[PDB]
Amino acid sequence: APITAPDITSICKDASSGIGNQEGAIRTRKCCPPSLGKKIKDFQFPNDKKVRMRWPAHKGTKKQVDDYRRAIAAMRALPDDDPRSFVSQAKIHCAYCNGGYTQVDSGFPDIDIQIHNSWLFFPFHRWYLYFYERILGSLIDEPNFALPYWKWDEPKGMPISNIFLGDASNPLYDQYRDANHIEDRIVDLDYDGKDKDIPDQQQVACNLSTVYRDLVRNGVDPTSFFGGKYVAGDSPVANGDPSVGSVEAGSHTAVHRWVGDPTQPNNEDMGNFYSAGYDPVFYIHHANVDRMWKLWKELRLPGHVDITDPDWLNASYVFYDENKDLVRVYNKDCVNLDKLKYNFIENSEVFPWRNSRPPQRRKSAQVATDVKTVEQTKFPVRLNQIFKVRVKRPAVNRTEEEKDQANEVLLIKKIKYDSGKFVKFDVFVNDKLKDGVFTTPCDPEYAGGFAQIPHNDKRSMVMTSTARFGLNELLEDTNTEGEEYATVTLVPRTGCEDLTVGEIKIELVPIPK
């Protein structure tokens, strides 16, 4: 029962999800696409001669930048009614991420479609950028046109590229950005709403670890990387969201909240799904998120495999192409970049984040072990303060052979909260440092976090979610592979006043091959 986008030009409604303040929304909620009386045709693979090479936004040639600027300028010049227009392209994101469509074609007209918070996250945005990229190319007669990508997994590429800065005369410019972050400032891939008073050196090191954390530590298998299973009939109210992937809830979300203008009602443009598409950097951010998918597989680590579930493969969306034709595309058809005739320009060397595993904790920095166990704790627990609890592990002292067959994964389920605002809390495991020990935002005890852009549903006031954290490296890094219990510490960062956690448990997840 795969999620199937309906006739988007026939069945559509104004965005009513993930927008905390609709009264005063600076951008429109009328995200329905133009009706040009076109029939939805099946997708056909491109016959391009050369492969479109996407370039780092901070290492672009004069031609690459000018072509990109001229292309956006052309897109901004089109009428709003045009499917290829700047406004229309932005509305695509709004329609799919803020309840524009329903699962009516699958027989559930009372259930909205949400590409986010699911395994549809990566493939959707790949198709999104795919048509977006080919549209820009055709508007300037560049058959070999290629988008840039925000290479924030590389130090010199972490600050916003200056090509997006300046003033309104620049097509790539957007006034609706965080003023405190547009001054050549380094991005925080683990942003929680408040700037950190740490050196640039520390921030880069933590950014590199965040990439490693999202692609290696927590991206241990397809479920934890792409996101949870999401089939037709699935409602966010009955019951909750498909667990969110490591990238989506991690570095991806961080950039959205870091770029978005906090002075605006819904943190427009980037800070919210419904308005993100109005900022040119949005597509360039997702160009690298799209690249994380590529890198995640090129690591060729165990468990880093493609999805084979037919419910994923047969899931489909609808887009307008450069010829204003309605095209239905399937997830199965975007797994191969060679077939889509594009790729990314890499440094010919080793990725700077490849070895950004947190440093081993010294036993001399740790003390011996009073925290209650799950059996002693009354759930659900509310995270309006730091919460500590000991969780029984599924095993202890696993051999190297055992760890290569299954991941020890911490599962935090039934996370209920008002999704009208941005939510984030951090997760630390086996924290037992002595007093006076120096700490960093990228310590080994840090398992990562659960961050959520507002995506509150139309007919519920509360959304439910799930997070997955890999412990194979962490337990080693903390010298606690032998301990029967794992002390899990949940630290709220923002929007956790009403947040509650329903269940916490550690399980062995077999590595798929």
Catalytic residues: 93, 116, 125, 252, 256, 273, 286
Kindly state the tokens that stand for 302. 């165990």
455 annotated among ligand-binding-site residues: no
How far apart CA 457 and CA 175 sit, in angstroms, is 29
What is the number of other CB atoms lying within 10 angstroms of the CB of residue 398?
A: 18
Q: Do residues 461 and 454 lie in contact, with contact meaning Cβ atoms separated by under 8 Å?
A: no
Say which residues have a Cβ less than 8 Å from residue 159's Cβ, sequence separation at least 6: 58, 184, 185, 186, 187
Token pair recorded at residue 2: 């795969």
The response to whether 304 counts as a known ligand-binding position is no
Q: How far is CA 394 from the centre of its chain?
A: 29
b/e per residue 328-352 (b: at least 16 CB within 10 A):
bbbbbbbbebeebbbebbeeeeebb
Q: Tell me which residue of 449, 471, 446, 474 sits closest to 383, measured CA to CA.
A: 449
How many CB atoms sit inside 10 A of residue 195's CB? 13
125 is in an annotated binding site: yes
Using alpha carbons only, give the angle 258, 263, 265 rounded to the nearest 5 degrees.
Answer: 100
Say if CB 316 and CB 2 are below 8 A apart. yes
Does 286 carry a binding-site annotation?
yes
Q: What is the DSSP string of 341-402?
A: TEEE-------TTTT-PPPPPPGGGB------BGGGS-SSEE-SS-EEEEEE-S-SS--HHH
* Binding annotation: 93, 116, 125, 252, 256, 286
* Binding annotation for Cu cation: 93, 116, 125, 252, 256, 286
* Binding annotation for Cu(2+): 93, 116, 125, 252, 256, 286
